[PDB]
């Protein structure tokens, strides 16, 4: 992220790279806004995009992320992926899918 005198972490660390990708990703928007998509169900799933993003971000910085954390988080994103694919009216779903997918790519092991 730099600052004035940047020459600090001269170790290519996945902490720096990923946490920056993740924070800049999540920073741009709100849980309740940039479409509630479908009011109720996909409003919940939009909350899930932004709140799993913010929580996993702060838990990465905290170091709380275990190996278990990732398995639960991935299968929860893919749960909500199929919940968004169960959302019969798909226009809003392009955002949802590309967001949880891009997030899954940011935290390594890129999706499809």
Q: What is the strand and helix layout of this fold?
A:
Layout: H1 14-27, H2 41-62, H3 67-86, H4 93-106
Characterize the structure shown:
- The chain is mainly α.
- It has one domain (14-108): MAST3 pre-PK domain-like (hypothetical protein mp506/mpn330, domain 1).
- It is 62% helix and 0% strand.
- It has helices at 14-27, 41-62, 67-86, 93-106.
- Helix 1 (14-27) packs antiparallel against helix 2 and helix 2 packs parallel to helix 4.
- The chain is elongated and about 50 Å long.
- 19% of the residues are buried.
- Interacts with the microtubules. Part of a low affinity complex that associates with, but is distinct from, the postsynaptic density. Interacts with SNTB2.
- It is found in: Cell membrane; Cytoplasm, Cytoskeleton; Cell projection, Axon; Cell projection, Dendrite.
- Microtubule-associated protein essential for correct brain development. Appears to link the dystrophin/utrophin network with microtubule filaments via the syntrophins. Phosphorylation of DMD or UTRN may modulate their affinities for associated proteins.
């Amino acid at each position: 992220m730099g600052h004035h005198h940047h020459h600090h972490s001269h170790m290519p660390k996945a902490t720096a790279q990923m946490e920056e990708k993740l924070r800049d990703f999540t920073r741009a928007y709100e849980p309740d806004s940039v479409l509630p998509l479908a009011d109720g169900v996909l409003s919940f799933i939009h909350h899930q995009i932004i709140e799993l993003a913010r929580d996993c971000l702060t838990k990465s910085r905290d170091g709380l992320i275990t190996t278990v954390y990732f398995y639960e988080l991935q299968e929860n994103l893919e749960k909500l992926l199929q919940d968004a694919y169960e959302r019969s009216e798909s226009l809003e779903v392009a955002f949802v899918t590309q967001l949880v997918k891009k997030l899954l790519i940011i935290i390594s092991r890129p999706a499809r």
